[PDB]
């Protein structure tokens, strides 16, 4: 029964480091309604942090 | 005007031709290891399995 215990100490470990993700860095790309859809939704990400250095 | 329709047999010969056929992919796939002999005379018609917390 107790099995599952340890998922959920990770699955709560690894949650809240993405709100701290979300609260911290400064950056953002694009607009909040769109989807991630054609390659260079994706491609702009790795261009932005070449060009800031 | 010979007459020998006495003279021969009407013959049915022993082979039968093929007949429609079907196949079987649901059976294959789902699940059989955990129902297997757990339905027998000390059971009743039905049997419980638990959910995990």
Sequence with gaps: ?53 | PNNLDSNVSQIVLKKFLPGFMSDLVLAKTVDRQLLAGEINSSTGDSVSFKRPH
């Design chain 1, 1 to 53: 029964i107790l099995a599952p215990v340890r998922q959920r100490i990770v699955t709560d470990l690894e949650t809240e480091l993405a709100h701290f993700m979300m609260n911290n860095g400064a950056l953002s790309l694009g607009s909040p309604n769109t989807p991630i859809t054609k390659w260079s939704d994706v491609a702009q990400t790795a261009s932005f942090l070449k060009d800031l250095g």
